[PDB]
Amino acid sequence: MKEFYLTVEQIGDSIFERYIDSNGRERTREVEYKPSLFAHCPESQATKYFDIYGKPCTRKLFANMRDASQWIKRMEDIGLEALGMDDFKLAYLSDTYNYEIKYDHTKIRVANFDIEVTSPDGFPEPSQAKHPIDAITHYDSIDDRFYVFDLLNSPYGNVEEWSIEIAAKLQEQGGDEVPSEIIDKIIYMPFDNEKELLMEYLNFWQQKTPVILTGWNVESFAIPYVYNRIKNIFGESTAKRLSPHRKTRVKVIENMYGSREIITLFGISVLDYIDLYKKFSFTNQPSYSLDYISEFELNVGKLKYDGPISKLRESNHQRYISYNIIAVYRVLQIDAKRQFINLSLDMGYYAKIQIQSVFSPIKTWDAIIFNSLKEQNKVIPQGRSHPVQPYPGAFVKEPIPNRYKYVMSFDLTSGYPSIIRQVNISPETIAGTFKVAPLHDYINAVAERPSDVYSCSPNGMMYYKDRDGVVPTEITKVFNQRKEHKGYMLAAQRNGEIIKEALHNPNLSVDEPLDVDYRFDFSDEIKEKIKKLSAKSLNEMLFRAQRTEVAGMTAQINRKLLINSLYGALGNVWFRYYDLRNATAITTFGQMALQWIERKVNEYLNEVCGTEGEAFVLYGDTDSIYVSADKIIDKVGESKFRDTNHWVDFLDKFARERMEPAIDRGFREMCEYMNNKQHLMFMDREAIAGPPLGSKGIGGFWTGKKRYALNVWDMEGTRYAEPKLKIMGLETQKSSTPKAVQKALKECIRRMLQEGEESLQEYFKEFEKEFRQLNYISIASVSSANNIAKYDVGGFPGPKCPFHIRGILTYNRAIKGNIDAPQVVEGEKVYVLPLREGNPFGDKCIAWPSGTEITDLIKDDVLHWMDYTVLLEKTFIKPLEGFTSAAKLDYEKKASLFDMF
DNA sequence: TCGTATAAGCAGTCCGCG
DNA sequence: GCGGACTGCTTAT
Ligand SMILES: [Ca+2]
Ligand SMILES: [Ca+2]
Ligand SMILES: [Ca+2]
Ligand SMILES: [Ca+2]
Ligand SMILES: [Ca+2]
Ligand SMILES: [Ca+2]
């Protein structure tokens, strides 16, 4: 096989590399790598090395990495650019793996672990590590085994061995329901004392040294706790055995409001799954407890027990250990679905970076661009200091608040990356400037043509047309990968709808799910077999189709994230190729394209309807337009349609055969006007929306910018079995809105869009009457809690104290003295409830940690003093009033003359 | 919240508005 | 009461 790296580190003048050799075996080596850097030189000096602007360079080979580093400093002292890859391990990888890396994940050791620590005096601080580690479960991907290290004897209690037989049994048998599929993969090891547990763990770690290390909060809790505990008991040198090169570093993480410390383990790549999830999941969750995320992702029940966790080990050690094991498995189950480890490995090896660097698009793109240029013997520029400066972004059209019956939407495929490619926007392709006219003169095609030589953006920038820049070239490669995976995702989505249709008529029989690839549209043969299948087999196929769709979504949306973050990196001062001329060239061109094509679509539709000056485009944001189709539907007559799906086909056909060709012609003219390198503005139809045929549903509505709702029948070629609500920005989409309120507001919207005013009125009346029975957690608001200390004046609200912070301070007073009650953590999220006048907490609200029940001693009082009237008005009635006034209807029936009878 | 970008919505505080 | 200046938080893109 071809060799590939696992990890790489610089330690002084040595590179330390773990790698898989040509026989598929893990190896480690120390290499005294001699890096090269570059300086500009005279023309007469013959070289093969040139900077990105074509200026000749001489290569300087250093005796060691420390010499290169000192050379860079002295070059700053002189005032001259020091060119080349200053991160030497990236140069090492580039030299050592000078080909497209083909990696074999089965050879990479991925470890997933979790520890338990009993603590009677509140949260066990990792930096202190003053309590015994009483359980470790460590899963190894190569052995496919869960290794369990169990402490039987502790100052906080002596206990019996955990029983795998009881673990396996059902909850209803008194067991722990550890999944049967992992029961045989558990290797259980009990210990008399913590010292021998820990020494054994280190010996094990030496044998099975993680390459990728993950888990839930491992970077912030598990790793620092284990490191600092071993340090306290045995000393530093022993603690550093967690690094295969015996080197670690205490690493301070800073933000605007304080800082914390992590432990960097040299020769390990730590990918904490909580951070993978936050970056790549495209969710914003009320809570990030493993319990909460597992429930959301997997539909598994909460891991239930009696009493506080601080007494779980001594009261029920059996369950204590079983829940440690299940916690580890939960993360593997989330990854099986979401596939973020797979994503990270793909991106990391593509870029030739340390795998943990996938969190930084700046590092990722610096490595991609360096490797690309190095192939052509070109030399990268030195990074420079820049002050942070604002710059302008996208155009967003102000909609007229209203109901909108029939809507068709279009938007650009990979908008900003396509602009980069079309205009040829790159550091080394800047050709000059031209004198800019007001943006509207370009939009209306009345400004002078910018250039007859170079490719232009309306911000005044001109670019070379004779060859692609390195940014367009590399962004295209990742864009093409994105396109492939989006295709797989959309096929899986279409296949899912075929299964849902067939579930209307499930056959009474015993049979199996078909063995099919859900990434490709089902053949006619597969479709015929599906119509004969039972509900059980269809349901299992639907689940598999939906897992394939999720796998496709992860691959495509995060490749989209990566290329969009290259645009964004151009406006970040730490990026080697930072340049606000290029960032604004992209955003300003985007503004023009949107309003240019708005004009063209309006002109086109006014033409086919024989009107003048009528506005068919009702809204747009960044690179999308929403088109009113009422007049198109009315030109045929609603009476002519057999059913909903009939007019959806008609609009689908109109969009593809009439609108898109008009859109394409409009952008071809704009490309020539700007003299761009290549026409890449491709604005595909997205949504087809309207009410069910013959209903009183309103179809859709807008309240304002970034706030709308549409009843969609077809989305990018997916024809739904049942219409789907596309709701953007409204309170149903906000993590701050209470769960039960999201649900009720969504049903009100469904009724508005599908059934009409009377249906909405019936549902409102009922919700208002019954909502006081809703569980308190379901009706709590949610907020992040920053700067709690800033607003704490003697345990009371200081000036301008935010409502949610006030709630936290109220909580802090109510639990004072207790080292047992849960503390609210700075920067994490809280549930919030209003309180009726004259309550015992002495203020108008209370907040507590999100994803948890409020502690029992104040729970009853909170439940008794909850202000349901305020909660209803603020979270439900206010937003609904906004939706309904925008849609021009009433959520409460108005009086009439018929009331006289 | 260590980790690419800007535009823009709503909740709430503080206080003016005769 | 509303709305402007401001902070805080959370979306759409
Ligand atoms: Ca635990
Ligand atoms: Ca787009
Ligand atoms: Ca699209
Ligand atoms: Ca059937
Ligand atoms: Ca869009
Ligand atoms: Ca009480």
PDB file of C-alpha atoms and ligand atoms in Angstrom, chain A residues 411-413 486 684 716, ligand 3:
ATOM      1  CA  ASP A 411     -30.972  30.792  -6.102  1.00  0.00           C
ATOM      2  CA  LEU A 412     -27.347  30.566  -7.230  1.00  0.00           C
ATOM      3  CA  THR A 413     -25.501  27.296  -6.901  1.00  0.00           C
ATOM      4  CA  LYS A 486     -25.125  16.646  -2.839  1.00  0.00           C
ATOM      5  CA  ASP A 684     -31.661  26.776 -10.247  1.00  0.00           C
ATOM      6  CA  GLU A 716     -34.942  21.015  -5.865  1.00  0.00           C
TER       7      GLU A 716
HETATM    8 CA    CA D   3     -29.654  25.058  -5.565  1.00  0.00          CA
END
